[PDB]
């Protein structure tokens, strides 16, 4: 039965007086009784038209979510300070909503559909408006040479995937297949990267708890291709991640306390999720 | 606590030398906000390398650096007599605290 | 040949679209999926699992392990309620942080029968009966047992079997029900009363606890997605 | 070679995949439900008169 | 350009440090404090953000050091509420305005210290 | 026959209990060996079978009025347990399902309940507001002794000699998820009136078909008192809890020199 098929209809049930007890159970078994309301209440026969289509896993992650806000500028020609190109280590861990949605489950595969929305604004009293700017985006996979200056050889994009966006155009989109080295992503990693041996020194053997990989998805880089305009134009790029063809493999309870860092630590003081209400008061 | 550095390093003019700054886990390892500063006697510090291998304007190209594991090193190739002075390591230490190194006195022989 | 018409709504980025798009890494050889245990296809499957109710939420006992256990006792019988709930599973604070409440906070509309289960944690010598009842909306809430008899209820006898389940039948003036505290769509009331006091012999603890759970039935459904209210990011 | 499927109330909608690689494909939906018993699985199955 | 106040010498009692900067850098960028004991090397003290008044202190001096700001004169004040013989050092006010290329926590831009004040010596002894 | 009486036998060991609930197979898939369609490494796997698959017994634990709950990490708890531990420390890659069996017998006059939860990827929080993810391997792998939950959070104030320990709060399940939703995981509840034992058969769940056991813990077992122990005597009642584990369908692929981790 596909997800848009209807739920099972409730059969009519009359009054009953017999040893066939469905209402009693044992939670200690770890099961829960698969009751239907007809089996412990007197019920009418009704055809049920509702469907669980909109509770599909593919539908749950359709709403794409923001993951970063990278800041870029093209400074005035007379200034001595360098042009700010931005570099972002790709990760979902820094925005709480998508993190909570993904951390409902332990392991998952999904193709990532990235969409970039760009905005720009001036920063000084002058009105010497700059022409329509063009922005380069670059996928820098792990171990590739990250750029140092805005006009380095690294921006020649000989092998790196890259996208050029002209301002005022519709937002740029690109689809990324499942790029994880494992058979599925691991949102939690209950282990270490290196284990300290007795032969090793104290400094050599240490590693972070939960750091499955220090560069997992790769690195994203952005610059303004245009030369120094006489007036300072600054810009911000918003990246939106939209999972596609997603599968998940182990549920977990969602988090209550307010998140702190990449790991699963919690900050002092803020360990109070619930609030008061008297037991006797409706 | 502070980042480890050699106490002093020396070499004749024209030599190529390396100053090593080894931090703990987190620190130079996890983050890339590792920078180096220079300070002559009687003067305030001056930035010489701000990202891992990136150089600010007005600093000569003979300064260079790189990262590996929990260690990042400053390499000065073609040492000149004017480079004598203190050199300090600096990095970001986990959640919202910052740490300097012990410093190294570089003297030209 | 074909000329083209530019419909309105072109060049927008609808953040829930289903368009195609070019691939960044062409001819990428994806690793095959292994059959890991525990694949989920629909979150209603995750909704049909029992999870504890934080019943108590008193001023001193809040944000502590004592929240989950309701303290019964062998006192003389009275018609006052043991516990009470308002059955607005996303908005009632007692029900909001259950897993069913967590899922429902991501949706506006829901339907189908909830089922409440209770587990007796006292000694094996302790015995007694508890009335667990559900009142549909539109009346004064029950405060004495005489009022609560008229609604739907189950008399649970605490015997060898540990636990019993009350199914709350889907009685609603609409095909779906709001998750906000909309007065038009209120689910009703649930309360638990002593049909008889819990009698315990001598040289046994005089006080005992009951745990309780909520889970969906096969009838359960939700449609329209939203953003949850629990989490806040600052600084 | 288009792919045609029915909309739920019938009307049939049509789709064509314009790219080589599967990551470019639209989310087909039409996913399959499953029995939730695999998350409520003891070794023995009973519906009535359960032993502890 | 950045300006700083005088040098103090009294033992035990508290001492107030003063640092003044241009309005744009004051309002836009954070201000950092660093101490330089004789020959011992730099040591971070804390961070002031006058744009939002959020302040973070080094754990070594978490109690004694206190900081505050003034928008009218574009001036920040640091006060060491109690002093010890170890505090006999040269102190530096500094502004961080050269951004890093790396995006910090996916929402903010890191800034390294790039403009240093002249600094002020302080002595703690009879 | 009756569901209340159960016998298990793996290898040369057997457990018999007369007050058992029906055993739970976590996620409805029994443990099984690697299928040829899913095996990544090419070297011949070792299959010890009877040589490793028997019920070992971890340390005994005392449950009291003031106690707080306990936790263990697998396969790390079995590192000292015989030939399974030696095979784990000698090889690089390995995998194994487990049958966890918990025994806590008490008379009819006692009352209380334990929640036996099996948590995949059971991460836990650190003992510092600063220095996230800094917990060391020595503290992060307690071995057979296990570790204790705490009723409150108290971060380490001294950064000159950091402890780098865990500090898992009980009602947050050590990771920030409210305890009432812990039932999403596979579970069985002890009620001292109902059943004196509970048992979970846990398959090998991991993103990789086979994984480094020394680096990575697949499952973690949490024993939490959902209702406190109580007894007629006011003078601090105490009863023991015992956890026993049997690996099932274990495999170890790649052989290397002995690992000697710095636990000392």
Number of helices of chain D: 0
How many beta strands in the DSSP annotation of chain D?
2
- Helical residues, percent of chain F: under 10%
Provide the structure class of chain F: mainly beta
Largest sheet geometry of chain F: 6 strands, mixed
Instruction: Compute the number of structural domains of chain D.
Output: 1
* Helix share, percent of chain D: under 10%
Q: Rounded to an integer, what's the Rg of chain D over CA atoms?
A: 21 Å
Rounded to the nearest angstrom, the distance between the terminal CA atoms of chain F is 50 Å
Protein structure class of chain D: mainly beta
* Count, helices of chain F: 2
N-end to C-end Cα span of chain D: 58 Å
Compact summary:
The structure holds 6 chains of a larger assembly. By secondary structure, chain A is mostly beta strands.
Explain how this protein is built:
In chain A, the strands form 2 sheets. In chain A, strands 2, 4, 7, 8 and 10 form a 5-stranded antiparallel beta sheet that branches. Chain A has a 4-stranded antiparallel beta sheet with strand order 3-9-5-6, with no helix packed on it. Chain A has helices at 57-60, 96-102, and strands at residues 24-25, 65-74, 86-89, 107-122, 134-140, 162-166, 172-176, 185-186, 219-224, 233-248. By secondary structure, chain A is mainly β. Chain C has a single domain (43-56, 69-220), classed as Jelly Rolls (Sandwich). In chain C, strands 1, 2, 5, 8 and 11 form a 5-stranded antiparallel beta sheet that branches. In chain C, strands 3-10-6-7 form a 4-stranded antiparallel beta sheet, with no helix packed on it. With 235 residues, chain C is mostly beta strands. The longest helix of chain C has 7 residues, at 99-105. Chain C has helices at 43-47, 93-96, 99-105, 145-148; strands at 51-52, 70-73, 81-85, 109-111, 114-120, 129-135, 152-157, 163-167, 177-178, 189-194, 207-216, 221-222. Chain C is elongated. Chain D has one domain. Chain D is mainly beta. In chain D, strands 1-2 form a two-stranded antiparallel ribbon. In chain D, β1 and β2 form a beta hairpin. Chain F is mainly beta. Chain F has one domain: Jelly Rolls (Sandwich). In chain F, 5% of the residues lie in helices and 31% in strands. In chain F, the strands form 3 sheets. In chain F, strands 3, 4, 5, 7, 11 and 13 form a 6-stranded mixed beta sheet that branches. Chains in contact: A-B, A-C, A-D, A-E, A-F, B-E, B-F, C-D, C-F, D-F. Chain A binds chain E through residues 67-71, 81-82, 84-89, 91, 94-95, 147-148, and chain E through 97-99, 101-103, 105-107, 109. The PDB classes it as virus/immune system. Keywords: Complex, Fab, poliovirus, neutralizing, VIRUS-IMMUNE SYSTEM complex. The entry is titled "9H2 Fab-poliovirus 1 complex".
């Amino acid at each position: 039965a596909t997800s848009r098929d209807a739920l099972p209809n409730t059969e009519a049930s009359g009054p009953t007086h017999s040893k066939e007890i469905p209402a009693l159970t044992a939670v200690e078994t770890g099961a829960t009784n698969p009751l239907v309301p007809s089996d412990t209440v007197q019920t009418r026969h009704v055809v049920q038209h509702r469907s669980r289509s909109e509770s599909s896993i593919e539908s749950f992650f359709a709403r794409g979510a923001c993951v970063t806000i990278m800041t870029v500028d093209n400074p005035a020609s007379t200034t001595n300070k360098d042009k700010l190109f931005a570099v972002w280590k790709i990760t979902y861990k820094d925005t709480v909503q998508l993190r909570r949605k993904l951390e409902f489950f332990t392991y998952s595969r999904f193709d990532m559909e990235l969409t970039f929305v760009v905005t720009a604004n001036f920063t000084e009293t002058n009105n010497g408006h700059a022409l329509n700017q063009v922005y380069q985006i670059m996928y820098v996979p792990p171990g590739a040479p990250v750029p140092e200056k805005w006009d380095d050889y690294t921006w020649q994009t000989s092998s790196n995937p890259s996208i050029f966006y002209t301002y005022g155009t519709a937002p740029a989109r690109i689809s990324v297949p499942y790029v994880g080295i494992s058979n599925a992503y691991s949102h939690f990693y209950d282990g270490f990267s290196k284990v300290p041996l007795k032969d090793q020194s104290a400094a050599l053997g240490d590693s972070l708890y939960g750091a499955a990989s220090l560069n997992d998805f790769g690195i994203l880089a952005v610059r303004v291709v245009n030369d120094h305009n006489p007036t300072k134009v600054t810009s911000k790029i918003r990246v939106y991640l939209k999972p596609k063809h997603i599968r998940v493999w182990c549920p977990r309870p969602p988090r209550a306390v307010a998140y702190y860092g990449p790991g699963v630590d919690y900050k002092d003081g803020t360990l109070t999720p619930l609030s008061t209400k008297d037991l006797t008061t409706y | 606590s502070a980042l480890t550095q050699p106490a002093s390093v020396s070499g004749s003019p024209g030599q190529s030398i390396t100053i090593s700054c080894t931090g703990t886990i987190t620190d130079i390892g996890y983050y890339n906000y590792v920078s180096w500063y220079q300070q002559h006697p009687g003067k305030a510090p001056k930035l010489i390398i701000f990202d891992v291998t990136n150089r600010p304007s007005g600093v000569s190209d003979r300064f260079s650096g790189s990262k590996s594991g929990n260690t990042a090193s400053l390499t000065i190739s073609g040492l000149q007599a004017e480079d004598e002075g203190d050199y300090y390591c600096f990095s970001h230490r986990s959640n919202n605290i910052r740490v300097f190194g012990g410093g190294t006195k570089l003297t030209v022989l | 040949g074909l000329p083209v018409m530019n419909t309105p709504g072109s060049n927008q980025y609808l953040t829930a679209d289903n368009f195609q798009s070019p691939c960044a890494l062409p001819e990428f050889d994806v690793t095959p999926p292994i059959d890991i245990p525990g694949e989920v296809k629909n979150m209603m499957e995750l909704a049909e699992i029992d999870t504890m109710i934080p019943f108590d939420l008193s001023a001193t006992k809040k944000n502590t392990m004592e929240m989950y256990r309701v303290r019964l006792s062998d006192k003389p019988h009275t018609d006052d309620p043991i516990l009470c709930l308002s059955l607005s599973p996303a908005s009632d604070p007692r029900l909001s942080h259950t897993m069913l409440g967590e899922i429902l906070n991501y949706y506006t509309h829901w339907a189908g029968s909830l089922k409440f289960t209770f587990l007796f944690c006292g000694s094996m010598m302790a015995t007694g009966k508890l009335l667990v009842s559900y009142a549909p909306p539109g009346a004064d809430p029950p405060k004495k047992r005489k009022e609560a008899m008229l609604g739907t209820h189950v008399i649970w006898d605490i015997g060898l079997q540990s636990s019993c389940t009350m199914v709350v039948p889907w009685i609603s003036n609409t095909t779906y029900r709001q998750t906000i505290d909309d007065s038009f769509t209120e689910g009703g009331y649930i309360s638990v009363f002593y049909q008889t006091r819990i009698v315990v012999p001598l040289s046994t603890p005089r006080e005992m606890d009951i745990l309780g759970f909520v889970s969906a039935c096969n009838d359960f459904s939700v449609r329209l997605l939203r953003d949850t209210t629990h989490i806040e990011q600052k600084a | 070679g288009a792919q045609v499927s029915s909309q739920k109330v019938t009307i049939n909608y049509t789709t064509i995949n314009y790219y080589r690689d599967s990551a470019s494909n639209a989310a087909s939906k039409q996913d399959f439900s499953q029995d939730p018993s695999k998350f409520t699985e003891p070794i023995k199955d009973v519906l009535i008169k359960t032993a502890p | 350009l950045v300006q700083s106040g005088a040098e103090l010498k009294k033992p035990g009692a508290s001492v107030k440090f003063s640092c003044q900067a241009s309005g744009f850098t004051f309002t836009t960028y954070d201000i950092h404090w660093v101490r330089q004991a004789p020959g011992q090397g730099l040591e971070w003290m804390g961070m002031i953000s006058p744009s939002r008044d959020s302040t973070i202190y080094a754990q070594k001096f978490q109690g004694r050091v206190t900081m505050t700001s003034d928008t009218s004169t574009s001036t920040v004040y640091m006060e060491l509420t109690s002093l010890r013989s170890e505090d006999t050092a040269l102190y530096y006010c500094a502004t961080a305005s050269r951004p890093s290329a790396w995006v910090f926590r996916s929402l903010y831009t890191y800034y390294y210290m790039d403009v240093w004040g002249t600094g002020t010596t302080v002595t703690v002894s009879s | 026959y009756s569901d209340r009486v159960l016998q298990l036998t793996l290898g040369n060991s057997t457990i018999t209990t007369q007050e058992a609930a029906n055993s739970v197979v976590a996620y409805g898939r029994w443990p099984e060996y690697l299928r040829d369609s899913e095996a990544n490494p090419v070297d011949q796997p070792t299959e010890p079978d009877v040589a490793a698959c028997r019920f070992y017994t971890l340390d005994t634990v005392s449950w009291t009025k003031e106690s707080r709950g306990w936790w263990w990490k697998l396969p790390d708890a079995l590192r000292d347990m015989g030939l399974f531990g030696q095979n784990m420390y000698y090889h690089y890659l390995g995998r194994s399902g487990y049958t966890v069996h918990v025994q806590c017998n008490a008379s009819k006059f006692h009352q209380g309940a334990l929640g036996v939860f099996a948590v995949p990827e059971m991460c836990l929080a650190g003992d510092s507001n600063t220095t996230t993810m800094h917990t060391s391997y020595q503290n992060a792998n307690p071995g057979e002794k296990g570790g204790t939950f705490t009723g409150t959070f108290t971060p380490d104030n001294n950064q000159t000699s950091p402890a780098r320990r865990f500090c898992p709060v009980d009602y947050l399940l050590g990771n920030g998820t409210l305890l009432g939703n812990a039932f999403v995981f596979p579970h069985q509840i002890i009620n001292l009136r109902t059943n004196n034992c509970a048992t979970l058969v846990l398959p090998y769940v991991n993103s990789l078909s086979i994984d480094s056991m020394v680096k990575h813990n697949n499952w973690g077992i949490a024993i939490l008192p959902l209702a406190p122990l109580n007894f007629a005597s006011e003078s601090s009642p105490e009863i023991p809890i015992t956890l026993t584990i049997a690996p099932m369908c274990c495999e170890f692929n790649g052989l290397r020199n002995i690992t000697l981790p710095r636990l000392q």
